[PDB]
Amino acid sequence: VTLSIVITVFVLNVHHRSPRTHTMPTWVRRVFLDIVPRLLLMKRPSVV
Amino acid sequence: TRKYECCAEIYPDITYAFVIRRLPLFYTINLIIPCLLISCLTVLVFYLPSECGEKITLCISVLLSLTVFLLLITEIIPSTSLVIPLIGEYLLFTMIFVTLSIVITVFVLNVHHRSPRTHTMPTWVRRVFLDIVPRLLLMKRPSVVDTDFERSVKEDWKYVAMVIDRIFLWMFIIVCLLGTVGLFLPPWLA
């Protein structure tokens, strides 16, 4: 549960990032928006 | 053998010295580790974004937990005032620093919620907390220009809050590690 608290702090930090403060690395984009979502059977909607 | 003020003769005695050692696996499982786990959450408040609105909840809970543990230990150890347990020292110092984090976190929250309609950014703040300090902390602000004035200064205030947060995240980690090793390593190395 303590480990989950740490991970939740990190996830909250990630969720509240914007281009005005952080820049998205290309590897983060690739991995976490192409590979992992497919494996976890979660599909993002194709919107532009 | 020794002489007492009662009587003029020598009264012998035999003193037995029982040197006993406690097996430190019950109180380590039940007091130490639960104390350490809470102490691990002391620093996370500085990595929590202000917009989440949970900073105060995290540090307040940590403080009220460490306080409870100190009282539980207070009911085990004798009330003698000659020496202080190492566990008592560590808990107390963490409580002092957790309290310091609450004060800092309150101040950081105030900085994050400032806009031109209420406050004015001083010239040197823009120089120090947006140009110099971010470079040192290896956090680089993306180069973005916003036409709006009350969304660019408002966003600058938010970034200043993050920079102040990152300063103490580094400082507390150093202090937390130095304090722990600087307290429990001396005894281990008799």
UniProtKB/Swiss-Prot annotation, chain B:
It comes from the Eukaryota. Disulfide bonds join C6-C7. The chain crosses the membrane at residues 31-50, 56-72, 87-111, 167-185. Changing E75K: Loss of CA(2+) permeability. It is found in: Synaptic cell membrane; Cell membrane. A lipid is attached at C52 (S-palmitoyl cysteine). Component of neuronal acetylcholine receptors (nAChRs) that function as pentameric, ligand-gated cation channels with high calcium permeability among other activities. nAChRs are excitatory neurotrasnmitter receptors formed by a collection of nAChR subunits known to mediate synaptic transmission in the nervous system and the neuromuscular junction. Each nAchR subunit confers differential attributes to channel properties, including activation, deactivation and desensitization kinetics, pH sensitivity, cation permeability, and binding to allosteric modulators. It is linked to Epilepsy, nocturnal frontal lobe, 1: An autosomal dominant focal epilepsy characterized by nocturnal seizures with hyperkinetic automatisms and poorly organized stereotyped movements. Neuronal AChR is composed of two different types of subunits: alpha and beta. CHRNA4 forms heteropentameric neuronal acetylcholine receptors with CHRNB2 and CHRNB4, as well as CHRNA5 and CHRNB3 as accesory subunits. Found in two major stoichiometric forms, LS (low agonist sensitivity): (CHRNA4)3:(CHRNB2)2 and HS (high agonist sensitivity): (CHRNA4)2:(CHRNB2)3, the two stoichiometric forms differ in their unitary conductance, calcium permeability, ACh sensitivity and potentiation by divalent cation. Cells produce predominantly an (CHRNA4)3:(CHRNB2)2 nAChR. Belongs to the ligand-gated ion channel (TC 1.A.9) family. Acetylcholine receptor (TC 1.A.9.1) subfamily. Alpha-4/CHRNA4 sub-subfamily. This is Neuronal acetylcholine receptor subunit alpha-4. It comes from Homo sapiens. The chain holds residues 220 to 624 of 627 of the full protein.
